Amino acid sequence: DLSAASHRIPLSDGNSIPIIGLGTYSEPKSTPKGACATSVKVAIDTGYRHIDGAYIYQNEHEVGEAIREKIAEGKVRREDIFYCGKLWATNHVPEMVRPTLERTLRVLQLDYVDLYIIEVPMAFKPGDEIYPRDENGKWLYHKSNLCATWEAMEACKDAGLVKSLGVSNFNRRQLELILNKPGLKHKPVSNQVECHPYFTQPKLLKFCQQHDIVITAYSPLGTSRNPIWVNVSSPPLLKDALLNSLGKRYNKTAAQIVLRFNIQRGVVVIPKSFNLERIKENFQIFDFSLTEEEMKDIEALNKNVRFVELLMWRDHPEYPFHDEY
């Protein structure tokens, strides 16, 4: 059903989202300028029609530069491109939601984004710094009011600034808080969370599917394993015995195996790569399919261990990882 030329899956609001997209986060200090723009351009030439980014990644202007150039030359129309932006923790005050989205539209130099999501359920001290802390290093938190923040996101869709609304790093409770909100206008159509063979999100996936919420697997390849924030407790996902074994069977890499695993179960994948060859490799997942037995053996690889714990904020009231899901 899913092909390189056509792999968009339905969202509950009547829109659709390409099942594979290009992630664009890259460590600022160790990433050449223009690398994100080049990659987005290569991704689009390869066949990607979905790009995942965020203002705090500090390269949203490069993302816009690439999309606009590809539109300019006629490689794609704006409508063929799906861009997802994110609302960071220091911008959850209702009055700041729209101005924050507008800044991103100005950075991208686009009239709207296809998907705008609350980046994390935790609210931080409003200001310039994206990581608020006093002289003692104590993180400056802000009282979260997801319901209020959501109503402001809704107003943004009403103004035509965004086609779909969603969330990221939200547990069942935080999702319910919105899904049961009195007078809910636009339900979240997506929840972007860590998801791969080592963290399959079995219960959260069921919950979301139950409410017609599509899951977007971030860090679908198990992260770049940067110790600054990545829990390296688990061995490299792409070095996994079974994943590499199955790869040989289909003459595919473990990366292609894990990506295929998620899209075959209806989970959107947004693998990040700024490497010409790997960008292409990750897209070649429509010419084969895993058997029901292999799908089961891969799912059986789950360890219930996150590569992204965000432990520095485990004391925040809205930390999403205490609950079982």
Ligand X SMILES: NC(=O)c1ccc[n+]([C@@H]2O[C@H](COP(=O)([O-])OP(=O)(O)OC[C@H]3O[C@@H](n4cnc5c(N)ncnc54)[C@H](OP(=O)(O)O)[C@@H]3O)[C@@H](O)[C@H]2O)c1
3 state SS of 123 = coil
Residues 151-170 that bind ligand X (CB under 6 A): 168-169
**Strands 82-87, 50-52: pairing kind:** parallel
Distance (Å, whole) CA 165 – CA 94: 15
Assigned token pair, 3 = 């092909």
User: For residue 8, what is the DSSP state?
Assistant: E
Binding-site annotation, residues for substrate:
25, 57, 88, 119, 131, 229
> Whole-number minimum distance, CB 39 to ligand X, in Å?
8
Task: Answer for the pair 321, 171: CB distance below 8 angstroms, yes or no.
Answer: yes
By CB under 6 A, residue 23 contacts ligand X: yes
> Whole-number minimum distance, CB 182 to ligand X, in Å?
28
Q: Which residue among the candidates 57, 116, 141, 319 is catalytic per the annotation?
A: 57
Rank residues 2 and 54 by Cβ distance to ligand X and give the closer one: 54
Q: Is 325 an active-site residue?
A: no
User: For residue 227, what is the DSSP state?
Assistant: T
Q: Which amino acid is at 60?
A: E
**Residue from 90, 149, 219, 262 binding ligand X (CB under 6 A):** 219
Window of 21-29, 136-144, 182-190, 311-319 that interacts with ligand X by CB under 6 A: 21-29
How many C-beta atoms surround the C-beta of residue 35 within 10 A? Answer: 15
The distance in angstroms from the start CA to the end CA of the chain is 31
Q: Which amino acid is at 301?
A: L
Task: Answer for the pair 60, 108: CB distance below 8 angstroms, yes or no.
Answer: yes
By CB under 6 A, residue 282 contacts ligand X: yes
**Residue from 281, 294, 306, 318 binding ligand X (CB under 6 A):** 281
Rank residues 134 and 196 by Cβ distance to ligand X and give the closer one: 196
> Whole-number minimum distance, CB 276 to ligand X, in Å?
9
Residue ranges that bind ligand X, judged by CB under 6 A: 23-25, 52, 119, 168-169, 192, 218-224, 238, 253, 255, 270-275, 278, 281-282, 308
